[PDB]
């Protein structure tokens, strides 16, 4: 549903930058790797945590309830 609060591997907080990640991908039209590096994700654990996430919360909210 929502981006995980902390990285599973190390525990770094990654939920703050999900909106920033989307803005960089859309507003700045930057590639995935460049946006992730700008956000400040060095270890590939957080990189795959952010990149591999899927926003199912929006799809669930598409329904009336």
């Amino acid at each position: 549903m929502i981006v995980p609060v902390r990285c599973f591997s190390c525990g770094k907080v990654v939920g703050d930058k999900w909106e920033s990640y989307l803005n960089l991908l859309q507003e700045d039209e930057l590639d995935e790797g460049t946006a992730l590096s700008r956000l400040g994700l060095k270890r590939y654990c957080c990189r795959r945590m952010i990149l591999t996430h899927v926003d199912l919360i929006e799809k669930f909210l598409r329904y009336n309830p």
């Binding site: 591997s9 060095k42 654990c45 990149l51 899927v54």
Partner: protein
């Protein structure tokens, strides 16, 4: 799934798309509805609990949101009429004129006879309170599963095709990975967790990365599963570069190209990474194959696969133990 009252539904807490996805997955829309998560796998025999294809999963990751699942079970009840002018009633039994009473606690039932969402139910607690008049009445409640428990998620009441009152109660439970739970990669490897280690005990790489999973190397040779290592390498390359990797069967790319890209990303070409013992910090004598890989939590879980009997109910026909753990069999 919130509105779907399926008999048994399993929802992954944090679905993740694989780092290496075949080009046919988008047509199948697997990326939109992934079934699994990308976990950092180390192919090593660290503590000896991953033998026989078993695996070691990080306890810190488990409690931090790794492979957590939601299990929804729906119970349906009807007031089917046995004889005209006689029908069942959904009401809380009061012990008056009732001869069939079970161990299920009826306090959770409200005046209407149905537990509202947010009510703790376990064991044989009655979920639906139904009584059939007899000619004063006999209890016909639907007790909760003995081996399953959780918080009731939703309750709905409607009318059947013939107009009889019908009730459907969906109960939701949170299941966390345990040692007995079964997981599997995308290459036919099935493993049961042997031990859960915190992030401190598990070995860490030169960059401080602690794997979420540890798999014994002996699973690779006998099974001839060379594709798992290539998938792990491709996932590492994709994560380092940030671009999703193409893992289609007959892709032009080869292992050498992936290794060259990984080397360009400042890592060992073949994916081996120096790791340190978490118990003492000593560097491991042999380097450890390391990297992300996609895994799936199979429905087979020990919680629902554990049974024990001690002078339980016996079949009337043969006076022998009944069959089925759910029915307290032997």
């Amino acid at each position: 799934y919130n509105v779907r009252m399926d008999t048994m539904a399993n929802i992954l807490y944090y679905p993740q798309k694989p780092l290496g996805t075949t080009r046919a997955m988008e047509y199948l829309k697997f990326r939109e509805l992934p079934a699994g998560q990308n976990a950092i796998v180390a192919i090593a025999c660290y503590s000896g609990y991953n033998q026989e294809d078993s695996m070691i999963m990080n306890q810190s990751s488990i409690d931090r949101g790794l492979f957590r699942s939601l299990f929804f079970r729906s119970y349906m009840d009807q007031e089917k009429k046995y004889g005209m002018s006689i029908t069942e009633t959904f009401e809380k039994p009061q012990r008056t004129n009732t001869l069939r009473m079970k161990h299920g606690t009826y306090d959770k039932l409200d005046d209407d006879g149905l537990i509202a969402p947010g009510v703790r139910v376990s064991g044989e607690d009655v979920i639906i309170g139904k009584t059939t008049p007899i000619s004063s009445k006999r209890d016909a409640s639907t007790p909760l599963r003995s081996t399953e428990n959780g918080i009731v998620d939703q309750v709905l009441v409607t009318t059947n095709q013939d107009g009889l009152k019908f009730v459907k109660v969906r109960v939701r439970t949170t299941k966390i990975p345990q040692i007995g739970d079964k997981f599997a990669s995308r290459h036919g490897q099935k493993g049961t967790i042997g031990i859960t280690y915190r992030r401190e005990d598990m070995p860490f790489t030169a960059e401080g990365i602690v794997p979420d999973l540890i798999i014994n190397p002996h699973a690779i040779p006998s099974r001839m599963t060379v594709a798992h290592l290539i998938e792990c390498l491709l996932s590492k390359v994709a994560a380092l570069s940030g671009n999703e990797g193409d893992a289609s069967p007959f892709t032009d790319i080869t292992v050498e190209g992936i290794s060259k890209l990984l080397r360009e990303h400042g890592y060992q070409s073949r994916g081996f990474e120096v790791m340190y013992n978490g118990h003492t910090g000593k560097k491991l004598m042999a380097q450890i194959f390391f990297g992300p890989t996609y895994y799936q939590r199979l429905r087979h879980m020990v919680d629902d696969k554990i049974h024990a009997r001690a002078r339980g109910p016996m079949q009337v026909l043969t006076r022998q133990p009944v069959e089925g753990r759910s029915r307290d069999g032997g």
